[PDB]
Amino acid sequence: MKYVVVSGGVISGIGKGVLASSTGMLLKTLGLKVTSIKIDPYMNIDAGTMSPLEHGECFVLDDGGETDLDLGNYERYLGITLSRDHNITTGKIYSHVISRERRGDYLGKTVQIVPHLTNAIQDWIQRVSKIPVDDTGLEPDVCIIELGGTVGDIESAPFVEALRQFQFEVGRENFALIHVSLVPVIHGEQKTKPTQAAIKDLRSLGLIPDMIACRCSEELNRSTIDKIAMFCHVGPEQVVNVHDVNSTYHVPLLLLKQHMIDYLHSRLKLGEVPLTLEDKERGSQLLTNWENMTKNLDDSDDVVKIALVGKYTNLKDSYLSVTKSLEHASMKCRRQLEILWVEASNLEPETQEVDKNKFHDSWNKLSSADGILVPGGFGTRGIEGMILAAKWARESGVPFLGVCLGLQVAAIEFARNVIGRPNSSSTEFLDETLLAPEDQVVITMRLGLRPTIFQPNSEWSNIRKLYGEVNEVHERHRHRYEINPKIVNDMESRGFIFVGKDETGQRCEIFELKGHPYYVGTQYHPEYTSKVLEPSRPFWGLVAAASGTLGEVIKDINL
Amino acid sequence: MKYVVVSGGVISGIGKGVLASSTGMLLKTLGLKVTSIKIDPYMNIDAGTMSPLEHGECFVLDDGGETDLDLGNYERYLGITLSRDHNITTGKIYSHVISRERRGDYLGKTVQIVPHLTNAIQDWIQRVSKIPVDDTGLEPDVCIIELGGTVGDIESAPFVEALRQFQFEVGRENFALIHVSLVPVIHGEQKTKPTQAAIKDLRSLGLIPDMIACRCSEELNRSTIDKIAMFCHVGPEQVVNVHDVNSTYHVPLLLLKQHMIDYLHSRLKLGEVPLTLEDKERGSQLLTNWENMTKNLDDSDDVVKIALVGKYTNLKDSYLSVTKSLEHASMKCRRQLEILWVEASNLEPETQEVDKNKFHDSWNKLSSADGILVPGGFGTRGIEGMILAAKWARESGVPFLGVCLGLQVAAIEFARNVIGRPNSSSTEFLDETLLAPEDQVVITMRLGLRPTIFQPNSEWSNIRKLYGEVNEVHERHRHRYEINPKIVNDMESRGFIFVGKDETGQRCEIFELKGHPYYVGTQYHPEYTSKVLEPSRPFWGLVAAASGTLGEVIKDINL
Amino acid sequence: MKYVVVSGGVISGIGKGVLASSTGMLLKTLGLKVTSIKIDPYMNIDAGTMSPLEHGECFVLDDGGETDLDLGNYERYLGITLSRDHNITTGKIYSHVISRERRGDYLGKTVQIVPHLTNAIQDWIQRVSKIPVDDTGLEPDVCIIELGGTVGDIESAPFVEALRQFQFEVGRENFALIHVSLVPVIHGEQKTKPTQAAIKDLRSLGLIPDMIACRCSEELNRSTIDKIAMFCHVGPEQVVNVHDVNSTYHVPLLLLKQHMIDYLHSRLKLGEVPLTLEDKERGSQLLTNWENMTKNLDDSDDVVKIALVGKYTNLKDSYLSVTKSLEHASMKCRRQLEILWVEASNLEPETQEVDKNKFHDSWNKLSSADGILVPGGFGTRGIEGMILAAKWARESGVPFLGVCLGLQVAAIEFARNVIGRPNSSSTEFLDETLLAPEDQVVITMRLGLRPTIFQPNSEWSNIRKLYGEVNEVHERHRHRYEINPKIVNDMESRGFIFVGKDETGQRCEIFELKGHPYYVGTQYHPEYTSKVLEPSRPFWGLVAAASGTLGEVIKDINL
Ligand SMILES: Nc1ncnc2c1ncn2[C@@H]1O[C@H](COP(=O)(O)OP(=O)(O)OP(=O)(O)O)[C@@H](O)[C@H]1O
Ligand SMILES: Nc1ncnc2c1ncn2[C@@H]1O[C@H](COP(=O)(O)OP(=O)(O)OP(=O)(O)O)[C@@H](O)[C@H]1O
Ligand SMILES: Nc1ncnc2c1ncn2[C@@H]1O[C@H](COP(=O)(O)OP(=O)(O)OP(=O)(O)O)[C@@H](O)[C@H]1O
Ligand SMILES: O=c1ccn([C@@H]2O[C@H](COP(=O)(O)OP(=O)(O)OP(=O)(O)O)[C@@H](O)[C@H]2O)c(=O)[nH]1
Ligand SMILES: O=c1ccn([C@@H]2O[C@H](COP(=O)(O)OP(=O)(O)OP(=O)(O)O)[C@@H](O)[C@H]2O)c(=O)[nH]1
Ligand SMILES: O=c1ccn([C@@H]2O[C@H](COP(=O)(O)OP(=O)(O)OP(=O)(O)O)[C@@H](O)[C@H]2O)c(=O)[nH]1
Ligand SMILES: [Mg+2]
Ligand SMILES: [Mg+2]
Ligand SMILES: [Mg+2]
Ligand SMILES: [Mg+2]
Ligand SMILES: [Mg+2]
Ligand SMILES: [Mg+2]
C-alpha cells in the first residue's frame, strides 16, 4: 500500500479535498487502483444528525452511511464506492477504544492516547485501505488520506501523532505528505511568512512535507517559489502553484503541467507496483477522457438555465452533489450551465407583503428557467412555495425533475390541482391535524442503496428510456415517508403513472406524467450516483429536456 | 511614561507603522506629548549603506542620522523631531553590549542575552523615551514602540523577551500591546485561524495583547469579531476592524469611530497624567484640523498632475517622503494629486530603438504634466534622461522643482543649452575623464540639518517669497558634490541666479531662473521637513505653480 | 570534513565536554586527525576579562588567547593545539558581521540573522575546521563541535539554526548529532519524560539526534533504554548509557564497550576516509596506551598527598588544569593522588582569632602534605598566607612547586627570611607605598607561548634535568610583573639561582634553590602544556619528589 496524506495549512477550507481528489484522479492515469480515507477531527459519529448549515450536505453511501461531504468528492472523481468505515472521526476512534476497554481487550493495562489510541488509528487505516472500492475484487495500490481541520489544533493532535508513527510503522517510499498552504497577496506583494509558520508546526509535530501546494490569488512569482524552497528543505520542483481557477475540472491538468505525477512516481517508487499493459491503457484512456471533457468545457458557448428551487440557496454547499450532477449533465450536453438559485418561500405571495424585491427576483428567475429542479431538501417549511413551482412547470410545459421531497410536492400539487382535493398534504407538516386526503404517509429511515423495479406499462416513459430500459434501477435512499397507495390508482386514472416501485409494490419511487415533455420524479437521490464522465440519468434527462436534443440523447443511450 | 507596543502579525508589511502613527496622532488629541521608537530586528547599524531597493527610501534626520523609513512616518504624523537613538536595531544593541564588555563594565561576570542584552534594551527604551521631541523642553507622556518584523522570528526573540520583562520592570497600566493581524477572505468567508495561531505565539512568548487590530479586505462581520473575542480573552470592544481604505489620512478617524482612545484612556489611566486646559484645547485643535484636511480630501474634485522623473519608479516606496510631500501640498491647494511616475531613462531616444511602448508612454506622461519634479535620486545612470526633462520644462514654461540631483541636472542642462558648453557634466558620472567645464565638483557627506542663507539680490524670487522672506532657511542635507563656484557668475550673467548659499558662500544651495513662472532647485531635501498640516514650501510652490493660484498662496504665506 | 555536534540536554553542566573529548579520543584510535570547536552562547569576546568564579579557570593558548575552559579539555585528550578562532562566541560572531556591515561588504542589502549571521557561523566553522592542529601540516578529518548551553534557550537560537542549515549545506554522512540528556531516578524508578521533552525541542528546532547519551545515577535498565528508543526514532544500539563514574579517564572505555565507534563508522562512512597502515598503527597504539594508564589507575594503591595552596579552593574548577596536571604526574608515578585543598588566608594567624576550626584544618593539611603547590592564582589578597606555606617548605625540606605568583611569593619569602629585608614585597599589593626592596616590578600582559632559555651554570638543577637538559623551554605566559633584576645577584649570592630567563636576560622565569630536595618556581603556567600520556615536567618533578623516586624518574627522562 502507498499512502499520500493531504494536510493542514494556514486556514480551513483551503482546497485539500480538491487536491486530494485531483491527486487520486491523476495517479489513476498510471493504471493504479486508488482509495481514499477522510479524517475529520470532529466528534460526531456520522453526519446524519447534523444539519446542512455546517459542512454542507450530508452525503449518503450504499451502506446507508450518512457521511462527510468530502467522501462524495472522492466517489465522483475516482469512480469508487466507499463504506462508512472510510470516514474516520474522533468519535468513531475514541468510541472504538472505549468499547474495547469495557470488554477487557487491553488485558488490564492502562490505555493511553499514545500508544493505544494512536495504534487504533494505524490499525484502522491499514484495515480500511485494503477494502475493495472498484468494480473488481483487487485490494487498492494507493490510499489518499485527507487530514481535516488544520495542523496544530488540539483536535488534530492524536491524528498527526498517529501519522508521525505511521510514516515509520509503514516504510518510507510507501508514505508521502502534501501540505496545502496560503500565500496572501497584499499591496501587490506575495507574502511567505504564513507558509513558513505552517512548516514550523509540521516540524514541531515531527512531520516533513514532500510537496508544498501553495494556494494564491495569482500565479506564484518564481522569486516566491525560490523563497519557499529556501525555508522549507525542498527543491523548486516540489512547490506546486495552485492558484484560484474558475473550474475545478482544470485542477488535475494544472498539477499534470507541474510534474506532480513525475515527482510522486520517483518519491513513492510507483513504477515498481506490478501493473499490466491493460492497466496502462485504462490510465491514459481516463486521461484523454478528462482532456476531452475539459476542452468541451472551454469551447462550449450555448447556455442552459436550470432553476434549483429550495431553501437556504445562499449556502451553495448545501446542494453540492445536486450542483455537480447538473454540471455533469451540462458537460455531456456540451452547453454552459447556469444554476438559477430560487428560494421557494420567496415564490409565495405573502413575500410580496414582506419584501417585493425578493418576490419578483424569485419569479423573474423561475420564468427565465429552461428547466426546473426541486432538489430533495430537508424540513417542510418551504413546501407551499415549491407547490407553485411544480404547478408552474405542469401548467406551462417546462422540463421538471423532482427528487425525494420533489416526488412529494409534485404529487401534492397534482392532487390539489388535477384530481381536485384542494387541502391534500404532507403528513410531516401537519401530522395530528388528521385531514382525510393524506398524500404522504409513513411506511426507521429507508436508507442506502435499494432496488427499484419498473411497473410493466412504462416503456412509453422518458424516465424508463433514460435508464436504458433495464428492468431494475439501483439507487440510494434517505426518506421516511411514501406516497399513499390508496391515492395511486386515483392518480393513475388521471395520467400520473407511478412508473417504478419497490419489489413489494407498497412503495412508490418513480413517476412520469403522461403527455408533458419531461415531468419526472424520483424518491431516491440520483445525485449520489453521478460520475464526472457518466452523469446521473434523471439529471441528464432534465438538462437534455431543457436544451432540446432529449431525443438525440435517448438515441445515444439506447446503443 | 506610558508605553504602547505595536507588534507582529501573520505577515510583514501589514500596517503597524500606519496604526502606530494613527495611535500617536489620536493620543495627541488629548493634549498628551507623544514620542516613538522603531525597533528593527535587522542587523544594520543604520540605513545609510543600504540601497532603496529594500525597505524603501533612507530617511535623513537633523542629526545627520540615515535611518528607517518608519521614523519619517512618526515625524510627519506627530509633529516631532527624532535622533538616531530613536531607531533601535539588532546591530546597535549587540554593538552597545560588546563595546561595554571589552571595556570591562560587566566587572568580570559572564554576559548573557538574558538578562544583560535584554536589560540593555530596557535601559535604552527608558533613556530614549525621556528625550525631548517637541518645540518645548518637556519629557514625553507616551512612547509608541513599533516592533518590526513578525513575532516568533529568531531575530525578534531578544526584543519580545525584553518587552515581556519591560511589562513588569515598568508597572501594568504604564504598558499596553496592540497586535496587528490578518483576516483572509476566501470564497466569501472571513477566516480566523491565522489570527488564532498568532495569539498562540504571543502566549508562548509570554505577552497578552490589549487590542487586536484586524486587517482585512472587507469590514469584519460581527460574527468574526465575536469569534476572535472568544479565542483571545478580550471583549468585542477590543477587536478593531482596520479594513483596506484608499487613503491613510482616514485611518485615525476609523479608530476614533471604534472607541480606541476611549479604551486606551481606561487601560492606561491617561486621565491621571497632569495636563492644563491649554493642553486640552491644543488636542482638539489638532483633531478639528485633521477632520478639516480629511473633509477637504473627500469633497475636492479638480485634479493636478505632477511628473516625478526618476529611476525605479515601480518601487513607489523609494520616494515615500517625496510622495507624502506632494500630497501635503495638494491637500493645502485643495486639488486631487495624480503623480505621473516617469522613468528618466525611458525619456532617452535610444529607448525608441529598445522598446517603443516605453519611449512613448514616458513622453505621453511628461507632456501631460501640469508640473515636474526631479526628486533627488541616487546613482548617476539616469541623468541624460533627466536633462531632457529639465530642458523640456525650461523651453516650455512648465513648473519645475529640482531636489539635490535636481539642482545638478538643471545646472548641467542650463550650461549645455543656455551658456552653450555642450559636454559640461556631473563629475560623479565621468571623474577620471577630466573635461574642463565641470558643473559638479566635490567640496565626507554633507549631512543633516544645516543653515542656508539667501544671497542679497533675491527677494524677487518665488522661492525666497515662499519661505516667508525669512533671512535663513534651515533644511536637511545628504550630498557630496556642489555646483562649481567658477561657473556661478557665468550662470548668473545669463539669469540663473543662485538665490541661496552656505554661510561661507563657497556652496550653492537654492536657485531660481529669472522670468520662468517657477523653475526652482534646492540642494537639500525639502521632503524630510514636510508635515501633514504644514507642507514643505518648495513642494507647495510647485503644486501651486501647476494649479495656478501661486499668487494667492504667496499672499496667504505673507500674512 | 566530518562533523560531530555534541549538544544540549535537560540541564547545563551535564557532561558534553567529557563526551566530546572521549568521542574525539576514540575516533583518533582509528588513525583519524580530529579537531574541535567550542561554541559558547555567551556574549564575551574571550574569557580574559571574566573572573574564575564563573565557568572555572581561564585557559591560555599559544596565541595568547584567554579562552574557554572546554578548549583545555580538547587539547589534553586529543594531543592538539588550538587558536583563539576555535572558540566561537555570540560576541565574536555578532562582532564579525557588524564590522563587515560598517565596511559595506553586504553591498547595501539588509543584513538579517537568517541568512547572514547563520551564514557567518557556517563560513567560520568551515574556515576553522580546516586549520592544522597536529604536529603535521595535514587538514583534519573530523571536527567535534560542542554546542554550549541548552537547546531551546534564546542565546542558542542562531547556533541551532546555523547547525540545522549546516546539516544540508554539508552533506548527510558528513554530519552527526549526539544529544546528552538526564534520566532522573526517583523512588527507585528511572524517569524518561525529561529526555522526551528534550527530543521535542530538537524536532521543533529542526534537528534529529543520531545518538542519545543518557546521564544517570545508575546503569540504565534495558526497559528504560527500550522506552527512549520508542519515543525517539532510533534503535536500542543508539542510546548510550553514560552513568556517573568516579574517574573520567574511564569514559572512553565505556563508550568503546557500547559500540559508539562502530555506530559512527557506519553513520559517518569513516572507513571511506583515506588512511595508511601507519595511521592505523598509531590509532591502536594510542588505544593501548589509554588501556595501560586506566589499568594503572585501578590497580595502583600507594597514596601521595599534595597541598594546593590558594584562594577559593571550594570552587575546584578554578584550578581545573592544575588538577589535571597533578593527576597526569600521579598516573606516570603510579601513585594515587590526594589533593589537599588549602585556603592560604586560613594559614594566617589572625584566622585563629576569627575561627579556630579553619586555622587548624589548614595547618593540619599543610603538615600532612608530601608536596606543596602554589598554583598561580589571581588577586594579591592571600599572599601573606602563601609566604608561610613557602617558608614552611624551605625550613622543612618538603617538595615545592611555585607557578606564576608561586615564583613571586617564594622570592618574597626568601628576601624577607634568608636575605633579611623583612618588609620586601609584591608591588601589585602596595604600589603607591614606595618601599625600597621591591621584589616584584612591572616590565601589557606578557601572554601566550614564549621561549625561556637556561642560564649557563644550571645543569646541576633538578628543573633543567626534568626538561631533558634541552637548551630552551617553550611554555605559556599570563603575567604582568617580573622579579626585580637588581635583587637577582643578591639572591644568587645566597643560593637562590635564577636557572632560566627570557632571551634578553631582563626577565626571570625559572629558579631552583641550592641544596633543597625540590624547591622550584616557574613564572609560566606549566599546566596548559600537560597531556594525559605526557605530564608537564615541573608537576611530574613535584609528584616524584613527594613520592621519592625523583632519581629513577630523572633517569627515565634522560634516555
Ligand atoms: N484551486 C482552487 N481554485 C479555486 N477554488 C478552489 C480551489 N481548491 C479548492 N477550491 C474551492 O475551495 C472551497 C473549499 O475547498 P475544499 O472543500 O477542498 O476545502 P478543505 O480545506 O478541504 O475543507 P472543508 O471541507 O472544510 O471545505 C470549495 O468551494 C472549492 O471548490
Ligand atoms: N489600513 C490600511 N489600509 C490600506 N493600506 C494600508 C493600511 N495600513 C497600512 N497600509 C499600507 O500597507 C503598506 C505597508 O504598511 P506599513 O508600512 O505600515 O507596514 P509594516 O507592517 O509596518 O512593515 P514595513 O515597514 O516592512 O512595511 C503601506 O503601503 C501602507 O500604506
Ligand atoms: N560521565 C560522567 N560521570 C561523572 N562525572 C561526569 C561525567 N561527565 C561529566 N562529568 C562531570 O560533570 C561536570 C561538568 O561536566 P562538563 O564540564 O562536561 O559540562 P557541560 O555540560 O559541558 O558544561 P559546562 O562547561 O557548563 O560545565 C564535571 O565535573 C565533569 O567531570
Ligand atoms: O517592518 C519591518 C519589516 C521587516 N523587517 C526586517 O526585514 C525582514 C523582512 O522580512 P518580512 O518579514 O518583511 O518578509 P520575508 O522575507 O520574511 O517574506 P514575506 O513575508 O514577504 O513573504 C524581517 O524578517 C525583519 O528582519 C523590519 O525590521 N521591519
Ligand atoms: O475540512 C475540514 C474542516 C474543518 N473540520 C472541523 O471543523 C472545524 C471547523 O473549523 P475551521 O478550522 O473550518 O474554522 P474555524 O471555526 O477555526 O474558523 P475560521 O478558520 O473559519 O475563521 C475544525 O476545527 C475541525 O474540527 C473538519 O473536520 N474538516
Ligand atoms: O498521576 C498520574 C501519572 C500518570 N498518569 C497517566 O499514566 C501515564 C504514565 O506515564 P508517566 O508520565 O507516569 O510516565 P511515562 O511512561 O511517560 O515515563 P517516565 O516519566 O516514568 O519515564 C501518563 O502519561 C498518564 O497518561 C495519570 O493519569 N496520573
Ligand atoms: Mg469555521
Ligand atoms: Mg475536505
Ligand atoms: Mg520580504
Ligand atoms: Mg513599519
Ligand atoms: Mg563544556
Ligand atoms: Mg511510567
Residue numbers in the entry:
A (entry chain A), B (entry chain D), C (entry chain C): 1 to 443, 456 to 571
Reproduce text from the manuscript describing this model:
CTP synthase (CTPS) catalyzes the final, rate-limiting step of de novo CTP biosynthesis (Lieberman, 1956). Each CTPS monomer consists of a glutaminase domain and an amido-ligase domain connected by an alpha helical linker. Glutamine hydrolysis in the glutaminase domain produces ammonia which is transferred through a channel into the amido-ligase domain, where it is ligated to UTP to form CTP in an ATP-dependent process. Budding yeast have two CTPS isoforms, Ura7 and Ura8, which share 78 % identical residues.
To enable structure determination, we assembled filaments at pH 6.5, where single filaments predominate over larger bundles. We solved filament structures of both Ura7 and Ura8 in substrate- (ATP and UTP) and product- (CTP) bound states. Ura8 yielded the highest resolution structures, at 2.8 Å (substrates) and 3.8 Å (products). In the Ura8 structures, all ligands were clearly visible and bound as previously described for other CTPS homologs, including an imino-phosphate reaction intermediate recently observed in Drosophila CTPS, and the presence of two distinct CTP-binding sites per monomer recently reported in human and Drosophila CTPS. Helix 356–370 in the glutaminase domain mediates interactions between tetramers, so that each protomer is involved in assembly contacts. His360 interacts with D370 which would be stabilized by protonation of His360 at low pH, and likely explains the pH-sensitivity of the assembly interaction. We see density consistent with two rotamer positions of H360 that may reflect partial protonation of the sidechain at pH 6.5. One rotamer that likely reflects the protonated state interacts with D370, and the other rotamer that likely reflects an unprotonated state forms a hydrogen bond to a backbone carbonyl across the interface. The Ura8 product-bound filament is in the canonical inhibited conformation, but the substrate-bound structure is in a conformation intermediate between canonical active and inhibited states, in which the ammonia channel remains closed. This suggested to us that one function of yeast CTPS filaments is to constrain the enzyme in a low activity conformation.
